[PDB]
Structure formats: C-alpha cells, structure tokens
Design a protein around this nucleic acid. Structure first.
Ligand SMILES: [K+]
Ligand SMILES: [K+]
Ligand SMILES: [K+]
Ligand SMILES: [K+]
Ligand SMILES: [K+]
Ligand SMILES: [K+]
Ligand SMILES: [K+]
Ligand SMILES: [Mg+2]
Ligand SMILES: [Mg+2]
Ligand SMILES: [Mg+2]
Ligand SMILES: [Mg+2]
Ligand SMILES: [Mg+2]
Ligand SMILES: [Mg+2]
Ligand SMILES: [Mg+2]
Ligand SMILES: [Mg+2]
Ligand SMILES: [Mg+2]
Ligand SMILES: [Mg+2]
Ligand SMILES: [Mg+2]
Ligand SMILES: [Mg+2]
Ligand SMILES: [Mg+2]
Ligand SMILES: [Mg+2]
Ligand SMILES: [Mg+2]
Ligand SMILES: [Mg+2]
Ligand SMILES: [Mg+2]
Ligand SMILES: [Mg+2]
Lengths: 155, 57, 50, 306
RNA sequence: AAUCGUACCGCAAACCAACACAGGUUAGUUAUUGUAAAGGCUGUAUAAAACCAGGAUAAAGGAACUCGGCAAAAUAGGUUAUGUUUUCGUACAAAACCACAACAAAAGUAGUGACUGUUUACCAAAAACACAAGACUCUGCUAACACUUAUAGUGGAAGUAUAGUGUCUGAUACCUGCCCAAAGGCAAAGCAAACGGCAGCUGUAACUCUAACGGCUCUAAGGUAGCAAAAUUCCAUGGCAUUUAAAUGAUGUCCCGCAUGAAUGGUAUAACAACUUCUUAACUGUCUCUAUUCUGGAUUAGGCGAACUUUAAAUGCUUGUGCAGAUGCAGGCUAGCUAACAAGGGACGAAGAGACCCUAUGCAGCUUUAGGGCAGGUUAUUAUUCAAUAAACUACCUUUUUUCUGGGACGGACGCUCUUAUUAAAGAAACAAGAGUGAGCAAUG
RNA sequence: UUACAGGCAUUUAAUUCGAAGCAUAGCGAGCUAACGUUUAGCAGGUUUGCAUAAAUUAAAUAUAUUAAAAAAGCAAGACCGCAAAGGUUUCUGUAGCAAUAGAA
C-alpha cells in the first residue's frame, strides 16, 4: 500500500423540526401542521384547493388566524433598524404611519378569505373561548389591513 | 413467469363483477343500460321483454 | 442500395411519438413545451390545429 | 453417445428411424407417440392458457436469458404437483399426454367426489401408469407406483419422485424424465434422501412423495437432424467467444484463448465454485455431488486465510 | 334512425427519393390451346462521316487469344442393355433409339468446408460464421446466472440434475500418446477435450555405406501413431514417372518436417458448392485478320438552355542557362488571317490543405504480471438485530510509456581527465582517432 | 512624491480565423438489428417414406381368403421452375436516370 489513505466521516446536520414546505400532508395532524407553518398565500391556497374536503373546525380556525400574518406591508412603508433581530416583542423595523399592504397581495387575501367564510358557518356551534378569541383578534387585524370591512360573525 | 391467469381465475373475476343499472326509453320501447363499476362507458344490455325487474339475472 | 428514403409516413405513428398528449405525460416533455412557449413559436406540436 | 450404427440397426421400439432420403433426415431420430399410446393433441380447455413468448426479456425489456425466442406458439398446462385436495377421493386416468414444455409425460385424471360434479386435474405421469388405471393419495393407500404418501409411510429402498422440500408447498425435487430418489435412513424428525444428482440431504418426514419414476425412458435416444428443428422449439444460435472481437468478449483477440477459459464477464468456468460458502442451507446438506463433505466446502478459504 | 369517411391521384407528371427522377411502393380482381375480350397509351426536321454503344451474317482454320476459354457459340430434352462408387437412400459413364410449333447448355482430377442456411446497406459471398453432434465444468431451488440505486421488481421458469448456465471442438467412420516442475489462475493439497510445453553430443556389422546395438550430459516431460515438397519448404523451377512437338503447370511418389502432429483435434470420406486448381469432348469473330449491315447517339438545321475551371495575356521550335526537366531568360531558326470536324504528346492539365514517411503541449480505441485507487460482485475478519475495514480474484475509474541520429527503426551513446591532426599565442567541431577514471593512503599527511 | 501623455510588462474571453477531441443534460428504433401480437402471400409440374373407411366396391361365400388409385391425408430446412426475394459474372454509366442505377 504505497499511497497511505486517511478516512474522514462527515455528518450532515439537519433541522430538528420539519418545515412542511414541499410534501403533501396525508393525515389529520400533518394537514394542521402544513397550514400553521405556511409561509406564503400560494401555499395556503394550494392546500385548501387540494384538501378542501379533509377539513374540520380546527383547520378552518387555524387558517383564519394565520392569514393576517401572511399579508405583508409595503417595503416603502417600513424602515429597517440597525442590527436588530427578531425577538420577544422586538422587530427589526418600525412602521410609518398608516402603512399600506402590498399591491399584489390584497386580491389573493380577499379571494382566499371569501372561500373560507363560505364553508365556516356550519362550524359556529363547535367553538371554544380560545377559538372565539383568536377569530376576533384575526378579523381585527384583517380590518386594520385593507382586507375586510366588517366581521360577518361578530354577532 | 410470475404472472399467469388460469381459466378458473377468469371465471371467478367474471362472477364478481358489479354493474350500475339505468332504465331508458327508445322509440317507446324500454331498455336497460349498464356500466361496469371499473369503467366509464355505458351500453344498452337488453329490453324489458327479456328481463324481469327486481331479480338478479 | 439507394439511400435517402428514411421517412415512411404514418399518421398514427406521428401522433403517438410526438403528440401533445405524449409531451404532457412526462416531466421532460412538459419542459420542452415551456421552452417552445418561451421562444414564442406559433405552433407548439405537430398535433395542433384549429 | 450417438453412433450411426445405432440408427442403422433400428432396434429400440418406440422410436421413429427416418430413412436417409435427404441430408436433413440422415441422422434424425424421434419418438413414436402412437406406438406408445401417448396423446399428442390439444390440452384440456379448463386446465390450459395461451400466453405470449418472452424470448428471455424482463420487465425492463432487456435480454437477460440469451439464445431464446422465435419458436412456435406457446400454451401452458396447469399441473397439480400436490394432491392434498383429493386425498380421499380415488381418481381414474383418462389419457397420457405429451407437453413440449417438459421432458416427462402428463396424466389426465378424473375425480368424482360424492355429492359434486367430476373434477379434472393434471399430474406428472409415473413410469408404469396407463389409461384406465386408478390413482390414490393420502393415508390408507398402498405402496405402489402412482401413490402419494408422506415420508413416514414409505420403505427405505423404494424409489420415489416428485418430492416436497416443504410440508405442503408441492413436489419440486425429482421431475425430469426417468429420474428417481431413494431413502437411506429415517431419523427422529428427518430422513436421509439421495437425490438424482448423488447428493445426500436431510428432508423433513412430513413431506410427501410419489412412488415410482418419471414416465419417459426414451429421452436420451433423440437426435435432432437439423438446425431448424431446434429453431421451431424456440432456441437461437450462439457464437463462440474466440470468434468475436476484443470489445465483445475476453477471448475476442486474434489469438485463440490467450487467457484461461471464462464467462463473458471474466469468471473462470472450468471448476470455480459459485455456491455461497456461508449459505444458510448448509445445515441440511450432508454430502455434496461427488462425495465432498459439507464442512470441506464450508471451510476451505478460512483455512487458507489462517 | 345519431356521429365521421365518400371529389381527384394511387407501378404514379399528384405518394417516399431536393426534380414531370430508367429507383422504391401492400392487397383484391379480369381476356388468352400455338394466343389474347374489354380498357388504356402515342415521337421537332433529314441523311450514303470518323468513333462509341446494343443486335445480325460470314469463306478456310478452330483457343493458335489471354494472367485466365473473360465474352460469345454450341442437340440443348426423354428411354436405355451393361459397368463403376456408395453412409445402400444416392451419384456417374454408356453405343443406340425416341422428338409437331414454343422452352433449353457438360464431365472428370486435386485442395477446402459434411449438408440446406447466414455475413462487411455503398469495392471482399468465401475455405469466414452458424449448424445437428462430442466433451469439460458449475447449479439442491429463495438454484447458478443476468437486468436494476436495490431494501424492490423481473427474466431463468413456474422449469427441477435425462434440467438450466458458461466454454472449446464441429455430420459421420477409424483414432486421440507424455508432462501440474518454475511463474500464475482455480480447487477437496488436486486440475491439461483449463491457459501451456514436449533436447543434445559421441562410438559401432565381411569392400564401402548405414547404424540394429553402446557411452555421456541435462529436463516437469523430452513429439507416439498418422501425414508430409503441403493453403505449412529459406536452398528450389528438389529427384523420378505419367501428361505436350516443347512443362517454374497438374497428378502420383521419395522424405527429421528452415518452422508437421493428434478435440486451438490427426487421417480418410458418398452426396452437396454462382468457392480455388488442372484436364477431356464439342462449339465458336477470343484469335490468324477482319469485312459488310440494322437500331440509337455523335455529326447537319430550328427551338430551349447547364457544369468543372479562370492573377493578367497579343500564349511557336530547338540547344544553352536557371529552386538543378522553360510558351515568357541567352544564341540558332520561324512571315497570309479566324475558325470548323478529328486525335490526345505538353501546359510538372482539372478534381480532393498526401493516405505513404517523418515531426507535435497531439487525439482516440484496444491490450497487459507498467504506477495508483475501491466505487459493484465474490472471499476473509469483526460487530448489531439491508453494517464497518481490505497489499486477494473478477469488473470499473484515472495516469505514464526521453532526446541525439547523414530520414525513422535496430545498434550505440549521454559525467569528468590525458593525448593526435587543424604548426611553433590562446581558442576551435563531426555517430573522427588513441588511452584512462566513479579511487587509494592513519601514512603514501 | 502626486497628476497627465507615451513605451514595455503582469493579470482578466486580450491581435484575428481554424482542429481532431473531453464533460453535463435532453431528442431519436417511421432507416436498420433482434424480438412481441395480429394479418396475408408463394402459377404449373417431378421424385420419395407412410396413411383405409358409422359398414369402400366386387368375388369367394363355411374354411382359407383374393382383386382393384378402393384414400378430397400426413411427412421432405426434397427437385425443375412463373411470381417473388436476392446480388454470382460481364458490359454500360461515373456531378450519372440514380450521393450505388441499367441490360444480360
Ligand atoms: K457456436
Ligand atoms: K485473444
Ligand atoms: K434450399
Ligand atoms: K481450445
Ligand atoms: K459457392
Ligand atoms: K492533350
Ligand atoms: K542521407
Ligand atoms: Mg473477424
Ligand atoms: Mg467463320
Ligand atoms: Mg496459349
Ligand atoms: Mg459450406
Ligand atoms: Mg448454399
Ligand atoms: Mg460490399
Ligand atoms: Mg454463397
Ligand atoms: Mg460482391
Ligand atoms: Mg464429430
Ligand atoms: Mg495448428
Ligand atoms: Mg477442423
Ligand atoms: Mg442526332
Ligand atoms: Mg531546358
Ligand atoms: Mg524557347
Ligand atoms: Mg498536407
Ligand atoms: Mg527523435
Ligand atoms: Mg427446397
Ligand atoms: Mg443481403
């Protein structure tokens, strides 16, 4: 063995928690996880169109509560802080007064929400105080942003 | 050859075939149309003169 | 022997080998369609007519 | 070994000696099925199926078994190697038929269970069974040719065939024309059996076998007189390795046999072993073909390493 | 009972070949004794050159032609008493006899393969491959082996040692000898119908010659039978016989044969062959030696209308000269002008940046006991209830394989000193010549 | 020393044009090679080994049998040969009718 050999073993580290980004959910729990951790409206719309019939009360509530976070403000209405990172109660930017949402996101959010509101009414009697509180909070956020004008189920 | 279908298997499958039945009218004469559960094509099978509704012919 | 007769027309062969239904059945065929849409060719497949 | 004196004599009955009228008939020797009473027509409709020829191509479409294809239409027969279904019911032989897919003869047997319709089955024909004979299986059957019994009820010296390795899967061992196996001794839960190849093996006593031999004693006297005779059976010609070019075979070069004989993939073919040394089935083989003890084969390269 | 096809071309000027292309293109039907129903199609104007192509006839001779009976011609067909050879089925010779008009083409000898078959589309159809058949080896069934990332799946085979995988020989008849040392491979410490090998010197019988018969050396073993101037022979056209008026030819035979030889088989063999060799019969324009003629082209006239090529041209001979063979330079000659029909000496004539040879920062494929690697299988060791490591065998990946040289190869050479010729300052080359050296000494300082 | 103009050098497709080739990804078996399923074709003649019937036809008619193309078949990698599939030899053609054809 004229040419001596050295062997190294390299382990490929991976994230501990799975981000449901590409795979299709195939179970009750998987569908909930994909909806909760959705990153874009196109992903949430895709999930609803494909797995529309495999929805329950919890799935509808989760989709509504996460929609406000998927609507982003204009980059021209945000100012970035110097070196600040996301933390508990601290964001890397501060908002100018009366910030406006992105031009191309309003029609998507309005269309997606209309479909959700259509199929929700049958589930109104199976809600808990936690679910009711989250729905009220989500709609208030959806009104501050130019997505809705009133909450049909407020009464 | 790991895939062979013998005549006994052919007859068992034929006897375990399901159909969807529909009554139609043609020129004033009633016919029965059927569709195999695994296919999307309909066909006219027989007339009411040769078939007794309510049984398993 | 005389050469130059490598083409023996057959309508059924032409549709099955290069048809639109065939191009849409595989991932590589779908990419070929996109490439032709990007270049902007007026006819996409030999199978197309109005 | 074929010799031209054998064909000139024209002695053995049951063979067709074709007169040398043409170059393709001079050395041709066949079997006369009519003189033997063997049916050579179409198989039973309810026990046969027509299938396409594969020509040695797998589901990927590539050639995996060389020198096949181009024969006549293929029809397959369903043969019941395990007669456990009809244990108690006696059967009557209707015909003895020829099958081009095997070297033995098949027998058509009709059963008449009480309170049911007749049942037809195919069985591997024993050596001395003709039409009209009665075949029986299961407990309470005589030790005669054509009877199927478990190894616990068979004498030591009686030849047997169609032996089952597993208790109920079916006979697999002895099937070829004019072959048989013998039982040497029976232990607590196994019997020592000598196979047609000369191998001594352990077989569970609950397996079944058929008394007698296989039913074709003229297999080795056949001579195909033409190349086209085996083409009709579905065999294609093959080319010698030293006749090819270097990129095709290890023997391709202009010189003949520059290196020791080997397969197309470079493996020595004049004595190199191919069975796995650590095969799990070594626990059931006592002596291999030729008299080699199992331990000698199992531990041969381990001593050289040491 | 709805829906789609129905025109026209379809052996063709409409389809595949860039074309109105002498090429390619499937099936179904029809008249006709020596003939032939229906239907379908149609060519610028002439002729009394050479020459070319495709036919016809020919005095006397009949292979004298030629590398070679190439091409052409030829009673070609049927039935035979008798003889020969056979693998007993065949095949061949044969005086003679028999034919309405049409159709018509040998036998023997040797070499090689048994045979019918298959092959380099576009220069090779064969003695090359395949083949029935013989032998060797592996495989106990979740078989060996192959495809695949395989943990799948599939072929083998739904077959089971009288079966399946791989290898070399190649119908059939008679045969098939010795060696497993060294270096490898495989295996049960053995294996050659696995890959391979199978000597030399010297003395001797009446006169001579030869050596039946001795002596010595060495090796794992020392080539046995058979055959042999070969499809194998350098001397060579070997010696003898037959064949011719004449024999580098053919057949037979003699034979340690540069370098024959027994399953990379040895010696024979009826039949078969658009294979190679020689001979016989007959026939003939192949030839002595050519002549005449028919059809078409050329050639003449009208119409239509290409291509290779072109530095510029108003473009003689001869000797001399010269990058060493001159239309163009020097001497000696050459004086009506432009073309047509015809021939093919020169313009180192045209076509394709020489293939041969040598030279590259060369490229590619193939081979191996040239270097390195392990990444599939097998094998070995170890560990958990389809794994990890590798100086092994198979498969695969990647890299290396100087220059000088009276062309390259082959051979020889490459460091460092002394001497010879090119005079008596130094220096100075060639695969010029004649000699040394890769140290020694504890004293030889 | 800094700036500017010039000459030369280094690095980056770096004066222009030109290989045989190497690597990665896709499109091809309507030509051809082997194979699968279905379908169709091969005039007219010749030689040879076998084959008998719901009860073959006649005579014998018992016994013993006999005669007859009395067979609407199988077998041959069989023979001479029209179609067809080939490409042995010669000649013509050689940017040709044709990037492989024509006649025998
Ligand atoms: K072979
Ligand atoms: K070789
Ligand atoms: K033939
Ligand atoms: K060999
Ligand atoms: K030939
Ligand atoms: K000239
Ligand atoms: K020279
Ligand atoms: Mg070759
Ligand atoms: Mg004459
Ligand atoms: Mg002469
Ligand atoms: Mg031959
Ligand atoms: Mg032939
Ligand atoms: Mg050729
Ligand atoms: Mg030939
Ligand atoms: Mg040729
Ligand atoms: Mg032989
Ligand atoms: Mg030899
Ligand atoms: Mg030979
Ligand atoms: Mg003219
Ligand atoms: Mg001159
Ligand atoms: Mg001059
Ligand atoms: Mg050049
Ligand atoms: Mg050199
Ligand atoms: Mg024939
Ligand atoms: Mg050919």
């Amino acid at each position: 063995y004229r040419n001596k050999v050295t062997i190294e073993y390299i382990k490929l580290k991976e994230p501990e928690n799975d981000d449901y980004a590409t795979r299709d959910p195939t179970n009750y729990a998987q569908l909930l996880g994909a909806i909760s951790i959705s990153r874009h409206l196109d992903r949430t719309t895709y999930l609803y169109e494909t797995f529309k019939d495999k929805f329950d009360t919890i799935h509808y509530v989760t989709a509504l509560t996460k929609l406000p976070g998927l609507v982003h403000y204009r980059g021209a209405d945000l100012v970035m802080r110097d070196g600040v990172q996301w933390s508990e109660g601290v964001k890397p930017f501060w908002q100018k007064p009366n910030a406006q949402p992105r031009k191309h996101l309003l029609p998507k959010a309005q269309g997606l929400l209309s479909k959700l509101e259509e199929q929700f009414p049958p589930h109104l009697n199976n809600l808990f105080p936690r679910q009711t509180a989250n729905l009220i909070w989500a709609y208030g956020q959806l009104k501050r942003k130019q997505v809705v004008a009133a909450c049909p189920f407020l009464g | 050859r790991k895939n062979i279908v013998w005549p006994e298997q052919l007859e068992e499958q034929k006897r375990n075939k399901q159909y969807e039945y529909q009554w139609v009218i043609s020129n004033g004469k009633k016919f029965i149309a059927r569709r195999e559960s695994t296919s999307t094509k309909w066909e006219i099978w027989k007339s009411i003169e040769k078939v007794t509704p309510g049984q398993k012919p | 022997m005389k050469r130059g007769m490598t083409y023996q027309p057959s309508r059924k062969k032409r549709i099955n080998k290069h048809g639109m239904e065939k191009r849409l059945g595989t991932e590589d065929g779908r990419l070929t369609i996109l490439r032709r849409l990007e270049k902007g060719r007026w006819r996409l497949t030999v199978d197309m007519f109005r | 070994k074929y010799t031209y004196k054998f064909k000139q004599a024209r002695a053995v009955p049951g063979l067709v000696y074709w007169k040398p009228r043409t170059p393709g008939l001079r050395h041709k020797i066949s079997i006369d099925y009519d003189f033997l009473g063997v049916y050579t027509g179409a198989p039973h409709k309810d026990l046969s199926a027509a299938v396409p020829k594969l020509s040695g191509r797998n589901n990927h479409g590539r050639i995996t078994a060389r020198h096949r294809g181009g024969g006549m239409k293929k029809v397959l027969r369903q043969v019941d190697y395990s007669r456990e279904k009809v244990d108690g019911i006696p059967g009557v032989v209707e015909r003895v038929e020829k099958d081009p897919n095997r070297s033995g003869f098949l027998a058509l047997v009709k059963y008449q269970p009480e309170g049911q319709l007749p049942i037809f089955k195919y069985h591997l024909a024993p050596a001395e069974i003709k039409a009209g004979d009665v075949l029986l299986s299961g407990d309470g059957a005589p030790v005669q040719a054509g009877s199927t019994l478990p190894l616990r009820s068979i004498p030591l010296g009686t030849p047997i065939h169609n032996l089952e390795l597993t208790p109920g899967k079916g006979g697999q061992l002895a099937r070829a024309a004019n072959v048989s196996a013998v039982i040497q001794s029976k232990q607590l839960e196994n019997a020592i059996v000598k196979l047609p190849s000369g191998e001594i093996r352990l077989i569970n006593l609950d397996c079944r076998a058929t008394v007698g031999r296989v039913s074709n004693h003229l297999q080795r006297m056949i001579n195909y007189g033409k190349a086209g005779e085996r083409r009709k059976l579905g065999w294609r010609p093959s080319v010698r390795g030293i006749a090819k070019n270097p990129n095709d075979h290890p023997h391709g070069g202009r010189t003949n046999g520059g290196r020791p004989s080997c397969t197309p993939w470079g493996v020595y073919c004049k004595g190199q072993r191919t069975r796995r040394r650590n095969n799990y089935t070594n626990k059931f083989i006592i002596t291999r073909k030729g008299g080699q003890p199992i331990r000698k084969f199992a531990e041969a390269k381990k001593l050289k390493a040491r």
